[PDB]
Design a protein around this ligand. Structure first.
Ligand SMILES: CCc1nc(N)nc(N)c1OCCCOc1ccccc1CCC(=O)O
Length: 161
C-alpha cells in the first residue's frame, strides 16, 4: 500500500508557495509542515529543490526524493528519480512542490494538507496555483487563527479513498 499525500501553503487567491519562494511570513506553517512530514518520504521537483535555502537542503529528518527528467542532474543528500512511480516506494509519501509535481501526483493522492494564508496576493504571470480539488475530497475546514506574524491562517485536512 503506497499512500500519497500532498501538502502546500497558499494565499486566498490560490497562489502557492514553492520551495523557498514564499512571500508570507507564517512561522507556524513550518511547524505544521514538519509535523506532517517528519518520519516520512518527501518528493519534490528540481526547481523546488533548487529554490530551497542551502541550510534546509536537504530537509532534515526525512528521506528526500527529487523528481527530474534531466538525466545529468544530481543533488547531495537526496535520491534522484526520473518517474513519480519510482518515488512512491515508501508506505507514506508527501509531495511538497511544486506545481508541476502536484499535478503529476494528484491522481495518486488520498490526502491533502493545506495551509491557507489570509493575504492579498493576485495571480501574476509565472505564479503557480493550488491543485483544484473536486467533490471526491472529504474535508474538515479549520477556524481562522492569528499567527504570531499578525496574519490570519487556517488549516485544511482533505482526504479520499
Ligand atoms: C514550510 C513551507 C511549506 N509549508 C507547507 N504547508 N507546505 C509546503 N510544501 C511547504 O514547503 C516545503 C518546502 C519549502 O520548505 C522550506 C522553505 C524555506 C524555509 C524552510 C522550509 C522548510 C524547512 C523544514 O521543513 O525543515
Amino acid at each position: 500500500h503506497m499512500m500519497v499525500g500532498l501538502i502546500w501553503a497558499q494565499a486566498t487567491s490560490g497562489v502557492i508557495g514553492r520551495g523557498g519562494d514564499i512571500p508570507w511570513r507564517l512561522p507556524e506553517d513550518q511547524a505544521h509542515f514538519r509535523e506532517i512530514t517528519m518520519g516520512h518520504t518527501i518528493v519534490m521537483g528540481r526547481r523546488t529543490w533548487d529554490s530551497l535555502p542551502a541550510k534546509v537542503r536537504p530537509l532534515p529528518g526525512r528521506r528526500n526524493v527529487v523528481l527530474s527528467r534531466q538525466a545529468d542532474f544530481m543533488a547531495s543528500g537526496a535520491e534522484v528519480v526520473g518517474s513519480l512511480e519510482e518515488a512512491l516506494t515508501s508506505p507514506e509519501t508527501w509531495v511538497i512542490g511544486g506545481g508541476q509535481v502536484y499535478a503529476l501526483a494528484l491522481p495518486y493522492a488520498t490526502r491533502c494538507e493545506v495551509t491557507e494564508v489570509d493575504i492579498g496576493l493576485p495571480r501574476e504571470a509565472g505564479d503557480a496555483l493550488a491543485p483544484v480539488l473536486d467533490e471526491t475530497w472529504r474535508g474538515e475546514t479549520g477556524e481562522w487563527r492569528f499567527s504570531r506574524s499578525g496574519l490570519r491562517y487556517r488549516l485544511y485536512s482533505y482526504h479520499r479513498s
